[PDB]
Structure 1
Amino acid sequence: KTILVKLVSQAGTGFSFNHKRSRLREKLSLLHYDPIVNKKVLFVEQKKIRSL
């Protein structure tokens, strides 16, 4: 099974995007483009949306 989760930007902005990960693995963290800051920054998982 897999779960849809919400990755939140740690730049101080509220920008977020949804990604997929299997429920077995650990919480995700990633680098992604933040439009409001116009730079690549870290996105850290904060909440779970749904199970798919």
Structure 2
Amino acid sequence: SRIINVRLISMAMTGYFYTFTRPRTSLPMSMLKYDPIVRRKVLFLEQK
């Protein structure tokens, strides 16, 4: 209830995602991750 599991969706619209945890009383996660479909590092944003 204190922590949640969030899905970071690839902004390349390839359908790959990363799953991390973070507290509820925090801001959504945004990271620069590696997309294995296009084989490049793109921007990953939280699903919701």
- Is TM more than 0.5 here? yes
Cross-structure match for 1:39: 40
How many residues matched?
47
Runs of 4+ aligned structure 1 residues displaced above 4 Å come to none
List alignment gaps of at least 5 residues for structure 2: none
Distance 1:27 1:10 in 2: 15
Query: Within 5 A, what are the aligned runs for 1:24-35?
Result: 24-35=25-36
- The percent of aligned pairs where both chains have the same amino acid is 49
Q: Quick one: higher RCO (CA 8 Å, sep 6+), 1 or 2?
A: 1
Q: TM-score, normalised by structure 1?
A: 0.82
**RMSD of the alignment, in Å?**
0.9
Query: Within 5 A, what are the aligned runs for 1:1-52?
Result: 1-47=2-48
- Larger relative strand fraction: 1
